[PDB]
Amino acid sequence: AKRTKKVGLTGKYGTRYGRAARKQLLKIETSQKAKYTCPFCAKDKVRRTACGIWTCRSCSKTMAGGAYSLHTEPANAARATIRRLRLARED
């Protein structure tokens, strides 16, 4: 049976710190506890180990990523633009 109605994982904070902060943490903290997909394993076993550092619990590969998620949207676009610039260098 569902135990809370809105606060979710921020129920650990009680009545403290105000509504705007707890709203931000629910989104941030859900993201950093998530399981992501090994770009190599192809299995859903990547977990954060420190800010910026992500390890597959199956591959055992270690990767550099975002602070609170595996891939950031700026880095996705950068990788996409860099790839097109290389292929254009090919005659």
């Binding site: 770009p39 190599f40 192809a42 299995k43």
Partner: protein, 101 residues
């Protein structure tokens, strides 16, 4: 393209209903060295040392080897499993033609 893949899909299903095959790298090596493999099919994230070995073993046996255009999860989906499949080896085409390749 679009006509091309709907044949690759059609053949990949034909083998798994009528015709032998195996899923996995260790079953694929033991068959290629014995000359039972009519085809070998790999995923595009197949580990790089393992892929090098499969191609070398293939050229010695003259076993054709292609590359499926999706992750090891797509290959699992394509032949109808819930688990990732790095290598698929077809032993008898049965009702598939295999010309699609």
């Amino acid at each position: 393209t679009k006509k091309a893949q709907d044949s690759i899909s059609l053949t990949l299903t034909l083998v798994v209903k009528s015709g032998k095959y195996t899923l996995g790298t260790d079953q694929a090596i033991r068959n290629i060295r014995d000359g039972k493999a009519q085809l070998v099919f790999m995923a595009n994230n197949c580990p790089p040392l393992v892929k090098s070995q499969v191609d070398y073993l293939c050229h010695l046996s003259k076993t054709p080897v292609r590359v499926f255009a999706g992750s090891s999860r797509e290959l699992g989906i394509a032949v109808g499993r819930q688990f990732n499949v790095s290598i698929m080896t077809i032993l008898e085409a049965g009702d598939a033609d295999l010309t699609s390749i």
